[PDB]
């Protein structure tokens, strides 16, 4: 008879004695529950409530093996948290060790079929358990945040992007992979086609722009290749010829200028299509800064000479005024001075007959502590003429 | 990168909630024990032993302060059993910082109550006097009063 078999199984699960026996009991209980969940004919509604009464009898007199067994059961069975959601949210505080990881790994599988989720976790001082240097906790909490973000309000999303973007000093490429995935969500979905609904809904766009550029000097390859394949897409930087250069200044962010010249020619040369010679240039560019300086400073003048046909006279004044403004912004906002960059802007400005009036109060202040004085002297003398 | 957690530990204790100061001190002293033993460049090791040893702020004065309590036991215990690994990362170059550690451990023994922390004070004194042998450096410690 079927009504004694599983009863012996679950009464053995009640033998709270050894790390092998009840763990294996909960594991294969989850497996048989999953196969009868797909095999929805009969015999579920006895043993579900049998292990449920065993767990309810378990809970009050013992808790450690209760949470271990519930984690083991919901490791392969989703909906047996619905009878214990207030239980797990109740005794989530004031556990430590691996057991808090067990609670959070339980609650990961039920942050989809929930209503009014954020109040409890905000009451559980969640900004204290996103700031403990264990690794599995900090991976699983970002993994629930990637699910509990797209039901939230910006007045708490701005509270949530304040302690999660202190993870740009983190090991473990999957943790920063989650971190540069949630921001890749948030910048993709807060593009605001003239919404302007808040200060906070335009605050998190800025502090999500700040990291999706600063993560281009990652101390790992491949993870950079993810973000580069994202940036070389449509609706990030357009791809005719000039619009990439015209938008390419705004992702400056002087945390990166060391790499910025090599990155500029990299994005500029990515949209390329007597072939074998252009790819060794991008091979040599990102180790020797000097030939990167020369390549950028020659591509620039080539484009700005071959645009006399296209984008005619009434547009040229707009483009030159914006580029003058942007070069002013570069020289005003840099804090770490880079000589084969400072010389690059002051060696492309001293050729075109609209950018010579660059910034006489800031050019000298750059070239006096950049120690690239004989291009600043040449720039000011050529502007002092004509 | 250190002295941030040092001043954080120094300033977090004065107000109430004497379990929050305990957990924060546990976390930050674990941070110091992670981020000071890992370094190996010898001038920077001298920088660390000149950073954690200051006459106004530091671990010695922080453990001097809150001994009139019962809530700062775990952090003080971690400090007093961390210093017997810090006396073995370095050596007899600590000798002009010795008598303060001797007086610290002597008052911590003759002032506290629980032998969860009273024994590690005698552990630091029994490591230190075993190290610094019978020389000129035994005339600072008044053995005639210690006995």
């Amino acid at each position: 008879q079927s009504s004694e078999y599983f009863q012996a199984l679950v009464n053995n699960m009640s033998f709270v004695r050894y790390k092998e026996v009840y763990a294996a009991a909960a594991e294969v209980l989850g497996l048989i529950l999953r196969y009868v969940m797909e095999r929805k004919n009969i015999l579920e509604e006895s043993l579900c409530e049998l292990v449920a009464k065993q767990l309810k009898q378990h809970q009050n007199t013992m808790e450690d093996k209760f949470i271990v067994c519930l984690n083991k059961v919901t490791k392969s069975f989703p909906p047996l948290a619905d009878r214990f959601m207030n239980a797990v949210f109740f005794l989530l505080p004031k556990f430590h060790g691996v057991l808090k990881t067990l609670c959070l790994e339980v609650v990961l599988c039920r942050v989809e079929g929930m209503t009014e989720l954020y109040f409890q976790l905000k009451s559980k001082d969640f900004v204290q358990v996103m700031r403990h240097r264990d690794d599995e906790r900090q991976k699983v909490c970002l993994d629930i945040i990637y699910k509990m973000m797209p039901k939230l309000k910006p007045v708490e999303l701005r509270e949530l992007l304040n302690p999660v973007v202190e993870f740009v000093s983190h090991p473990s490429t999957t943790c920063r992979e989650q971190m540069y995935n949630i921001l890749m969500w948030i910048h993709d979905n807060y593009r605001d086609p003239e919404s302007e609904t808040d200060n906070d809904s335009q605050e998190i766009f800025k502090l999500a722009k700040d990291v999706l550029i600063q993560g281009l000097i990652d101390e790992n390859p491949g993870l950079q290749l993810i973000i580069r394949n994202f940036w070389s897409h449509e609706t990030r930087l357009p791809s005719n010829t000039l619009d990439r250069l015209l938008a390419l200044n705004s992702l400056y962010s002087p945390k990166i200028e060391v790499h910025f010249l090599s990155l500029a020619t990299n994005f500029l040369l990515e949209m390329t299509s007597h072939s074998s010679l252009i790819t060794p240039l991008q091979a040599v560019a990102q180790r020797d800064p000097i030939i990167a300086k020369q390549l950028f400073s020659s591509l620039f003048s080539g484009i700005l000479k071959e645009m006399d046909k296209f984008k005619t006279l009434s547009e040229k004044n707009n483009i030159t005024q914006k580029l003058l403004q942007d070069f002013n912004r570069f020289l005003n906002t840099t804090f770490s001075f880079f000589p084969p960059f400072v010389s690059c802007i002051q060696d492309i400005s001293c050729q075109h007959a609209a950018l010579l009036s660059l910034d006489p109060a800031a050019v000298s202040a750059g070239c006096l502590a950049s120690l690239q004085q004989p291009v600043g002297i040449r720039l000011l003398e050529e502007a002092l003429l004509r | 990168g250190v002295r941030c957690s040092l001043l954080r530990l120094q300033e977090t204790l004065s107000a109430a909630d004497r379990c929050g100061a305990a957990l924060a001190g546990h976390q930050l002293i674990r941070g110091l024990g992670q981020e000071c033993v890992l370094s190996s460049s010898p001038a920077v090791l001298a920088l660390q032993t000149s950073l954690v040893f200051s006459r106004d702020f530091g671990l010695l004065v922080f453990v001097r302060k809150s001994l009139n309590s019962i809530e700062f036991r775990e952090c003080r215990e971690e400090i007093l059993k961390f210093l017997c690994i810090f006396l073995e990362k370095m050596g007899q170059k600590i000798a002009p910082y010795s008598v303060e550690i001797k007086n610290t451990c002597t008052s911590v023994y003759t002032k506290d109550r629980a032998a969860k922390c009273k024994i590690p004070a005698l552990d630091l004194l029994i490591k230190l006097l075993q190290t610094f042998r019978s020389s000129r450096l035994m005339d600072e410690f008044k053995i005639g009063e210690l006995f």
């Binding site: 207030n86 109740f90 005794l91 505080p93 004031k94 009451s123 | -």
Partner: protein, 490 residues
């Protein structure tokens, strides 16, 4: 659990009407609630002084908590009872106390809902000790806080279902708006009036359950049975008199030594011996020999045959009688033999005799073990323990003797008059309630400096008899009962 404790959240209503005098001029229910709160804290400061307490007012204008929801403001965190916390809770009496509440928060708002149960739950979800009881004594009056919208009531009863999921037990103290059972509204799918008990039946007690000894009884040499030896008349007295340094309010923690052989110095306890002196000759021992000569047996109980319950007279005792019971912790399955031996002792009225050495080193004493059976009815009336009782017997020099040379007769007329007197003075003895005069006046005298109300409350004596209430119960038979057969007449 033995070192487990019990919490208590006191929830006080203040929105509109409980602050009202009910159009009366006797007392407001708000100050009645503060009377009850201050009395239960003045009781549990000395009765059970390790429980966890909290007090929360709901519905007001401001809000200070850890979750920042409206109309919820606490004053105390879950903690031990603090005399400073009751010296700040006693100021909310009278019109000026009501004014003080009104100018530190006021009252009145669109008050709470499920969210006050939420802040009770998150008050419980934080303290890291062990919990056994978790009760909420709500102080409110009305019987529909959902008097306009049904979603409030639906989410309130769902939230009460989720609080009974983990099982937090709430049972309010309903105030006397009709003085009793008339407003029987739909406040019944939440929970599963009497306040004079909480006002004064909790004066000074203590609560504990330990074991005091876990020994074994040997019948022949090889019948070992594991027993626990509990005590049930604790013979309590006052907490100890700590010494204090004068000005800075600190303890002393003094020391002691021995030295001075007219040379000075310090002598260790290693060189110390014991001695006794008779006139000139002194017998000298070491302390090991002194503690050695009180060694006669192992720790345990030793069977020495049986006795019937007829010779051990109740004139004989020397000890507060203990109680013994079998436990299945050391020797597996000995309660089976204990239940069988209990059955045959209650069926054949027999009682055992034993030799007792409780601690690991003690001279023996002869005890007698007497059977005992429970009493019960439907109200879980558990009043007598099922098991054995230990009466202690004297040995040799205890029973002294009187000079024994006195015997006079009497004459049977006074038996009926004395029957009339004892039936005038007849009463069933007790069930409790003969509380301690010295300890009661001591704890009230400590209370007088604790809360500084005005003075020592004169704790009423109860050991004295009501002399007038037995004078008038007797009547004017006193003088004939003196000189009916024995006139003094100088």
């Amino acid at each position: 659990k033995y070192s487990g404790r019990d919490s208590l959240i006191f929830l006080v209503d203040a929105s509109k009407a409980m602050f009202e005098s009910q159009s009366e001029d006797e007392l407001t229910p708000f100050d009645m609630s503060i009377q009850c709160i201050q009395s239960v804290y003045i009781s549990k400061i000395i009765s059970s002084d390790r429980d966890l307490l909290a007090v929360v007012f709901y519905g007001t204008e401001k809000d200070k908590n850890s979750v920042n929801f409206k109309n919820i403001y606490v004053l105390q965190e879950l903690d031990n009872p603090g005399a400073k916390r009751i010296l700040e809770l006693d100021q909310f009496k009278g019109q000026q106390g009501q004014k003080r509440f009104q100018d530190m928060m006021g009252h009145g708002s669109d008050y709470s809902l499920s969210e006050v149960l939420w802040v009770c739950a998150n008050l419980f979800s934080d303290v890291q000790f062990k919990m056994s009881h978790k009760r909420i004594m709500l102080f409110t009056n009305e019987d529909n806080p959902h008097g306009n919208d049904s979603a409030k009531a639906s989410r309130a009863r769902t939230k009460a279902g989720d609080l009974r999921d983990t099982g937090i037990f709430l049972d309010l103290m309903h105030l006397k708006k009709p003085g009793g059972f008339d407003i029987s509204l739909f406040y019944r799918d939440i929970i599963s009036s009497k306040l004079e008990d909480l006002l004064r039946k909790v004066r000074a007690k203590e609560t504990r359950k330990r074991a005091l000894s876990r020994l074994k009884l040997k019948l022949n040499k090889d019948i070992v049975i594991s027993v626990g030896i509990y005590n049930l008349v604790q013979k309590a007295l006052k907490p100890p008199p700590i010494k204090l340094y004068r000005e800075t309010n600190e303890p002393v923690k003094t020391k002691t030594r021995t030295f001075n052989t007219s040379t000075g110095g310090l002598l260790l306890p290693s060189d110390t011996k014991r001695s006794q002196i008779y006139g000139s000759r002194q017998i000298i021992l070491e302390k090991e020999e002194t503690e050695e000569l009180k060694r006669f047996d192992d720790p345990g109980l030793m069977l020495m045959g049986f006795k019937p319950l007829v010779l051990l007279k109740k004139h004989h005792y020397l000890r507060p009688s203990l109680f013994v019971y079998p436990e299945e912790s050391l020797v597996i399955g000995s309660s089976t033999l204990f239940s069988a031996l209990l059955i045959k002792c209650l069926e054949k009225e027999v009682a055992a005799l034993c030799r007792y050495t409780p601690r690991r080193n003690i001279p023996p004493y002869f005890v007698a073990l007497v059977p005992q059976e429970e009493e019960l009815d439907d109200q879980k009336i558990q009043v007598t323990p099922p098991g054995f009782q230990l009466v202690f017997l004297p040995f040799a020099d205890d029973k002294r003797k009187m000079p024994f040379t006195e015997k006079i007769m009497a004459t049977p007329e006074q038996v009926g008059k004395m029957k009339a007197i004892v039936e005038k003075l007849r009463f069933t003895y007790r069930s409790d309630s003969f509380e301690n005069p010295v300890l009661q006046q001591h704890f009230r005298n400590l209370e007088a400096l604790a809360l500084d109300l005005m003075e020592p409350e004169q704790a009423v004596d109860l050991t004295l008899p009501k002399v007038e209430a037995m004078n008038k119960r007797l009547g004017s038979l006193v003088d004939e009962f003196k000189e009916l057969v024995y006139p003094p007449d100088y």
